[PDB]
Amino acid sequence: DVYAQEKQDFVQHFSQIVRVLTEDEMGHPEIGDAIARLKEVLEYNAIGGKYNRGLTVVVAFRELVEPRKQDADSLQRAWTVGWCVELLQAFFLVADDIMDSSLTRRGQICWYQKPGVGLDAINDANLLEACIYRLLKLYCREQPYYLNLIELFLQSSYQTEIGQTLDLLTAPQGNVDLVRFTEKRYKSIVKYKTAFYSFYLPIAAAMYMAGIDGEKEHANAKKILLEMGEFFQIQDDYLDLFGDPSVTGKIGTDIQDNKCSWLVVQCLQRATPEQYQILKENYGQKEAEKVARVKALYEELDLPAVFLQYEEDSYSHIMALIEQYAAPLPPAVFLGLARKIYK
Amino acid sequence: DVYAQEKQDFVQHFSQIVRVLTEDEMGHPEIGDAIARLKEVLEYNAIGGKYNRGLTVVVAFRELVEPRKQDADSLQRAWTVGWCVELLQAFFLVADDIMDSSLTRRGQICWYQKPGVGLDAINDANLLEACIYRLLKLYCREQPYYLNLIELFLQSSYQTEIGQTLDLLTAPQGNVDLVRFTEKRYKSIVKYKTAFYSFYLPIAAAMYMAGIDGEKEHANAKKILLEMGEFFQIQDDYLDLFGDPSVTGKIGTDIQDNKCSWLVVQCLQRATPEQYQILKENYGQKEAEKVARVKALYEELDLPAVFLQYEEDSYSHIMALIEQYAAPLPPAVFLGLARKIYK
Ligand SMILES: [Zn+2]
Ligand SMILES: [Zn+2]
Ligand SMILES: [Zn+2]
Ligand SMILES: [Zn+2]
Ligand SMILES: [Zn+2]
Ligand SMILES: [Zn+2]
């Protein structure tokens, strides 16, 4: 709700982001074709999602900064940094869809699967990352928190990249071993690959702009946010197989890609040796029938039910964490976030 | 020479770089497998080249900073930033070899062509980039030039990425048009894709550590260095076809990849309509015979001779630029660099 009534402003502000990332180089006509390609990459890859992560920076900003400091300029910096978080996401998805061999994202074909794009998408992803820091400099160069944001974004990228490394190492193609698909291993992957940049990063950016730079305050916010992030990726795993493609906007690949998903960890925990053997011989393979075999085993073990029960318990667990760790921050900062991802 | 007698120190110092990038995370055992993979990526991709770019930061540092300020610690920061430039390079080569469909680099098979690696190499490249900023923070957090280096490296990456975008747009696969292969277009590509990070970036980093942050001094250094860079990429184009693979350490792909190389621009400038038609129908294709046809046309037009003449004239041109633009900087800063790449 407090997002929805602030979304439209955010989405519209994108045109100025795309304008300013393009006119910055008007005094360099020779790179015109590159700047055009960057436009195309932005319009295709920073748009069509829910913008939750960017809206969070903005929403949290209004809650953290005293109203008599929210000038038209502080507001503009807030949603630029918001779009910066969306660019980080755009950067990671473009590359992730190549490495996961995905087909669609946000209701359209993956950038790299577009005729004419292919593996040039790799440089496209890097430009999106670069755009972040061009904007931080254009809008926040002179702010007291400038360097804090730079380091926040860089650190968040390294963490996400460590996460992706765990995510790929644990899912070797053509290499089944269900034995590495454990609960500890799972929690490590999603903490790094999702939770830092999706939940800590947006709120922390807002915090730093609000002048809240205390190590102890960030640690507290972090305790809540990384746990939210853990649930959010479990939800992403569940929806990869059981979600509605018209809603999720994309086709799941976790079983074919041999991924350490929450679903496969839960399945391993409940399976008889007969069932385990069936998973062993059908997982991590590209054949429709073998994937359907795994899905059927999940439903036989009533994992969709198990998931629905974990969403209730997780939600209670996160609310408690908010009771313990929210202050001095307004609990609504975390509640509007929790509200957005639960049910 | 002033490099060679400083090389061995630089190369040995790499172990501490790899150690410090690995122990930073000892208090995070869960990412052990990721940190191991990062080790493997570093050892395979930051090693086996000539280290010219990194040595330049170091060499230029000794020339720019007063000796009674070169403590054991300032020296250590100097060659860390030197290795940071080498990591940027490692980052760009890994990704470039995928997008150029290259086979070998520095005498070995390309990282991404290694069994088991494949397109996971994309995340590997991003980790190498991340490593830069981990090191800048570990060693230069408290220096006055800290933020200047961060911005220098980020800006250099965006410029190189603009360069790569021009490089790829101009070479559409399956799309011959020799008409876009012009001299202006060529100069634009190599300026951005090579000259900024290979020549401006190392010297500028040294400058900033030496406290030389003046806009006018950097512009002057830049005038010399980007022109050196233009020649260096022309040399890279020449060697891609006519260089010795035991020396260059890699197989050329410019004709197959349909690239706007200096060789193809020179050929277009000298060719009769008969010759032009032969280029038109043999360029940009993967067939050995068709590539041999192009190479033969280059030799018929005596391009190797033309190149040798451009190396002489370029060298004179760069020396003049050094006479005009070097001061107040020691001319040796630029002379040791020029000496390293000419003949
Ligand atoms: Zn994915
Ligand atoms: Zn993935
Ligand atoms: Zn997923
Ligand atoms: Zn290449
Ligand atoms: Zn290339
Ligand atoms: Zn080349």
Curated annotation (Swiss-Prot), chains A, B:
<dbReference type="GO" id="GO:0003723">
    <property type="term" value="F:RNA binding"/>
</dbReference>
<keyword id="KW-0756">Sterol biosynthesis</keyword>
<dbReference type="GO" id="GO:0005654">
    <property type="term" value="C:nucleoplasm"/>
</dbReference>
<comment type="similarity">
    <text>Belongs to the FPP/GGPP synthase family.</text>
</comment>
<feature type="binding site">
    <location>
        <position position="193"/>
    </location>
    <ligand>
        <name>dimethylallyl diphosphate</name>
    </ligand>
</feature>
<feature type="binding site">
    <location>
        <position position="50"/>
    </location>
    <ligand>
        <name>isopentenyl diphosphate</name>
    </ligand>
</feature>
<dbReference type="GO" id="GO:0005829">
    <property type="term" value="C:cytosol"/>
</dbReference>
<dbReference type="GO" id="GO:0004337">
    <property type="term" value="F:(2E,6E)-farnesyl diphosphate synthase activity"/>
</dbReference>
<keyword id="KW-0460">Magnesium</keyword>
<feature type="binding site">
    <location>
        <position position="233"/>
    </location>
    <ligand>
        <name>dimethylallyl diphosphate</name>
    </ligand>
</feature>
<keyword id="KW-0153">Cholesterol metabolism</keyword>
<feature type="modified residue" description="N6-acetyllysine">
    <location>
        <position position="280"/>
    </location>
</feature>
<keyword id="KW-0007">Acetylation</keyword>
<dbReference type="GO" id="GO:0005737">
    <property type="term" value="C:cytoplasm"/>
</dbReference>
<dbReference type="GO" id="GO:0045337">
    <property type="term" value="P:farnesyl diphosphate biosynthetic process"/>
</dbReference>
<feature type="binding site">
    <location>
        <position position="100"/>
    </location>
    <ligand>
        <name>Mg(2+) 2</name>
    </ligand>
</feature>
<feature type="binding site">
    <location>
        <position position="96"/>
    </location>
    <ligand>
        <name>Mg(2+) 1</name>
    </ligand>
</feature>
<keyword id="KW-0414">Isoprene biosynthesis</keyword>
<feature type="binding site">
    <location>
        <position position="106"/>
    </location>
    <ligand>
        <name>isopentenyl diphosphate</name>
    </ligand>
</feature>
<keyword id="KW-0479">Metal-binding</keyword>
<comment type="pathway">
    <text>Isoprenoid biosynthesis; geranyl diphosphate biosynthesis; geranyl diphosphate from dimethylallyl diphosphate and isopentenyl diphosphate: step 1/1.</text>
</comment>
<keyword id="KW-0443">Lipid metabolism</keyword>
<feature type="binding site">
    <location>
        <position position="194"/>
    </location>
    <ligand>
        <name>dimethylallyl diphosphate</name>
    </ligand>
</feature>
<feature type="binding site">
    <location>
        <position position="89"/>
    </location>
    <ligand>
        <name>isopentenyl diphosphate</name>
    </ligand>
</feature>
<comment type="function">
    <text>Key enzyme in isoprenoid biosynthesis which catalyzes the formation of farnesyl diphosphate (FPP), a precursor for several classes of essential metabolites including sterols, dolichols, carotenoids, and ubiquinones. FPP also serves as substrate for protein farnesylation and geranylgeranylation. Catalyzes the sequential condensation of isopentenyl pyrophosphate with the allylic pyrophosphates, dimethylallyl pyrophosphate, and then with the resultant geranylpyrophosphate to the ultimate product farnesyl pyrophosphate.</text>
</comment>
<keyword id="KW-0963">Cytoplasm</keyword>
<feature type="site" description="Important for determining product chain length">
    <location>
        <position position="92"/>
    </location>
</feature>
<comment type="subunit">
    <text>(Microbial infection) Interacts with HTLV-1 protein p13(II).</text>
</comment>
<dbReference type="GO" id="GO:0006695">
    <property type="term" value="P:cholesterol biosynthetic process"/>
</dbReference>
<keyword id="KW-0753">Steroid metabolism</keyword>
<comment type="pathway">
    <text>Isoprenoid biosynthesis; farnesyl diphosphate biosynthesis; farnesyl diphosphate from geranyl diphosphate and isopentenyl diphosphate: step 1/1.</text>
</comment>
<dbReference type="GO" id="GO:0033384">
    <property type="term" value="P:geranyl diphosphate biosynthetic process"/>
</dbReference>
<feature type="binding site">
    <location>
        <position position="100"/>
    </location>
    <ligand>
        <name>Mg(2+) 1</name>
    </ligand>
</feature>
<keyword id="KW-1207">Sterol metabolism</keyword>
<feature type="binding site">
    <location>
        <position position="105"/>
    </location>
    <ligand>
        <name>dimethylallyl diphosphate</name>
    </ligand>
</feature>
<feature type="binding site">
    <location>
        <position position="96"/>
    </location>
    <ligand>
        <name>Mg(2+) 2</name>
    </ligand>
</feature>
<keyword id="KW-0808">Transferase</keyword>
<keyword id="KW-0225">Disease variant</keyword>
<feature type="binding site">
    <location>
        <position position="250"/>
    </location>
    <ligand>
        <name>dimethylallyl diphosphate</name>
    </ligand>
</feature>
<keyword id="KW-0752">Steroid biosynthesis</keyword>
<feature type="site" description="Important for determining product chain length">
    <location>
        <position position="91"/>
    </location>
</feature>
<dbReference type="GO" id="GO:0046872">
    <property type="term" value="F:metal ion binding"/>
</dbReference>
